[PDB]
């Protein structure tokens, strides 16, 4: 199978950064991993300024430009570091780990969002105006063949319900008709929040621009409506899954209650040709995926005496 060479260099560089930084010699990141081991946490925090001094930014800029393609190698290196220094954090009561970046040099507004930063690591600021429920998202799927009863596991899913194709270890031939084992599958927390532009960035006469920010994992409910929050994460693009052949008849080929814009009828450039689409046209829109959130806008004596210095 074809492998990457730059990804390997980033993976070893991240391991060296985690093992060697130690600048306060305190082993600050090893201190954090020990704190996670004792407190049973599932997310790590990496500062950009700390990384901004090793390799003269060669690693930092490489991570920033292509965060989307380098994240799998960063997690792979983190797994090896955890195994080497703290095996207890390798299994649960495996913990799906998360990496949280913060303290980026420059901040962006919502009106600086262009398609040429898709996949890059950015930080944005805005006022929250709507939040949704904490729904469970399917992370690692598990199925059973209807006839063989063979078990498949760890079937990655990107944006739609994806079942396996080629059957496991025997002679059995089967393209479909699987049964999700909802008990064995891994799930994660999911939340969608709507943000708009700040009162100062809004021009004299303007209808405010909006965006969809996705919070996942331990970052749920940390943004409340009406507050002013600074998000940081990766800028992604989300397709329309309805015309990507969803299994159920419930989608019913884009059932609608309101009338779409006639102005952008045929003006929105949709790509065709793919076999999954058929003769349909796939469309895209820009959304944000956030990994770290910050905000920029007990009468018991015994417990009280504990906190104070």
């Amino acid at each position: 199978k074809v492998d990457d060479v730059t990804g390997e260099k980033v993976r070893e560089a991240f391991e060296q950064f985690l093992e060697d930084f130690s600048v306060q010699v305190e082993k600050v990141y090893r201190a954090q991993i020990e704190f996670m081991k004792i407190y049973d946490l599932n997310t790590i925090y990496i500062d950009y300024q700390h990384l901004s001094m090793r390799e003269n930014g060669a690693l930092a800029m490489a991570i920033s430009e292509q965060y989307y393609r380098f994240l799998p190698f960063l997690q792979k290196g983190l797994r090896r570091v955890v195994r080497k220094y703290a095996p207890e954090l390798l299994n649960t009561s495996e913990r799906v780990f998360q990496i949280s970046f913060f303290n980026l040099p420059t901040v962006h507004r919502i009106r600086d969002i262009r398609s040429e930063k898709i996949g890059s690591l950015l930080s944005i600021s805005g006022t929250v105006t709507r939040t949704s429920e904490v729904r469970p998202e399917l992370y690692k799927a598990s199925f059973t063949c209807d006839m063989c009863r063979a078990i498949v596991d760890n079937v990655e899913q990107s944006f739609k319900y994806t079942e396996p194709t080629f059957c496991p270890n025997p002679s059995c031939e089967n393209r479909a008709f699987w049964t999700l084992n909802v008990t064995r599958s891994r799930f994660l927390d999911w939340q969608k929040v709507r943000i708009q532009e700040n009162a100062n960035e809004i021009p004299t006469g303007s209808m405010p621009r909006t965006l969809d920010v996705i919070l996942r994992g331990d970052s749920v409910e940390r943004a409340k409506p009406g507050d002013r929050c600074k998000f940081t994460g990766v800028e992604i693009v989300v397709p329309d899954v309805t015309q990507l052949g969803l299994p159920g008849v419930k989608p019913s080929s884009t059932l609608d209650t309101r009338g779409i814009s006639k102005t952008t009828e045929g003006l929105n450039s949709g790509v065709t040709g793919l076999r999954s689409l058929g003769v349909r046209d796939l469309t895209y829109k820009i959304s944000f995926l956030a990994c770290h959130v910050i905000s920029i806008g007990e009468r018991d004596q015994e417990v009280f005496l504990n906190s104070l210095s």
Binding site: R111, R114, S115, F159, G205, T272, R275
Partner: protein, 609 residues
Amino acid sequence: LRIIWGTNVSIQECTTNFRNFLMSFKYKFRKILDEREEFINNTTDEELYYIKQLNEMRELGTSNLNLDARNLLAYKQTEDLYHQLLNYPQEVISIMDQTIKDCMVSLIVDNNLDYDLDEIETKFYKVRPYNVGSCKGMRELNPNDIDKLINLKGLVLRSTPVIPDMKVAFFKCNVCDHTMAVEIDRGVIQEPARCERIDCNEPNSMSLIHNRCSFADKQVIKLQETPDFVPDGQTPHSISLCVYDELVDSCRAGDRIEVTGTFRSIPIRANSRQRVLKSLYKTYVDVVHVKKVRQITDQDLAKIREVAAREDLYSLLARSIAPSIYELEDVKKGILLQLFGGTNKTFTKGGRYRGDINILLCGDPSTSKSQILQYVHKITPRGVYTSGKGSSAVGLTAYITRDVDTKQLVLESGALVLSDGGVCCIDEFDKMSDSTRSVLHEVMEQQTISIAKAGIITTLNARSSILASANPIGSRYNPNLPVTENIDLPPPLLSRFDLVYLVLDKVDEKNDRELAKHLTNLYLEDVLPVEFLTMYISYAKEHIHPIITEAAKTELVRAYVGMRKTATTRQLESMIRLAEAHAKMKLKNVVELEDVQEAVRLIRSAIKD
């Protein structure tokens, strides 16, 4: 020799004609072309207009051109391109960019300097032609000029967010994990058949990686036909505009713009599922140039200083703000002092202390207060002029409203929030409703507005200044009755205003004749800076912060005590603000006796009325 298929355009002659045009053209040929008499040839004939712009662009590094059509027609040999561009814009523009590619090299190596030219090689250039032809409205567009450059005019209604457009697809193999990029042509993606790797070579093993592709930016604009050209009993028409690359996010909503672009028509599908199309196309335009309808220089600083060195700066800008208004110099004094405002401070322990001046004008009903308010509206940088007669009870603050285009939620600020850091003018103060009045009460007391609706709890910032104008009950303000009965305003609301002026109109022969005289002289057809005030106001408001010295202490304490020989403590904090605002004028960095004397004189002349 060879010609691009379909058209008659050939690159060979076009490139040579364009280079001859650029190195040869001057204002000499332009003024020979137009030759409208009274045409200046004072050294302009040899200025080499194109080469100087080319060099200044090279040294700046920006890629923006303003090639005109009349200038392109000026040269005799390149006259062919004038009629060769109107009919085939795309290919001619492609030749345009290709020639500009080496227009850089033609000038960087004339003296053989050490410019890298590598960043020039990487970057690309384009052109923005304008004034292509006679401007015609959207109401006269036939199918006879599809794919031809036109110039349109219209009102901007709305804009859409940035739209991604795929350029380079990206396919990965689910077995051998091999990555290959496939370019797309006109939207259609030619699917890879089987993995190129001969060893892997598996049928139907392709997966599309959406977030590893390459995208470009699009924007769509909506225009409306201007009300002037529409005839009787008609409904305005609409046209959609396509904007790409650097021109995205240029046209604000509600503006009126004249654009240049290529007319185009595309088919739209009859059925969503089937391949079938219907025999009626949609028409739009792809735009290439858009036109509509801080950073002060050191010379501006010098002229500001020398003007500030004037003996009497007070009276000059007293008369400049309202040239039409005759007499009423005292209210203009107060407004001039208001437009600067005392210094603002927020220390940790005590908290923020206000630095805005509030002024209320009231009196007999046929004075000129509304014109005074509309005068101060323009001078101030950021401000809003809306009457208080009606509208929503929170119309000056945030109002959570349902979005019209999308069934979503939008938080829209009001007029007090939109006048943050400036002067907000309220007209018809007496008609403002009893329920909305309380809103202003929290604005003039804490300078913040809190909204708690639809699951949103938040606070905004007002920090503005209120200048208001009111009218009494009846046709006259009789002096015998006190202020309270006539103005129909709550005592606290009137009290919290920093300065209150009474405008009186008495039947005086001298005053009536003098007023009528200059009014008729204005109607008769036969020391006022234009924009110096705005820059001086910005300089004084954004850089200058005065302080207080004991010389102000000695006068202020004894003045307040002497006024207490029914002056509330509000009076002293009003004197301090006015004195510190006067100190910002006659540019200084500290207060002295003159400022406090002027402030007390103003606040006691206010008491006299």
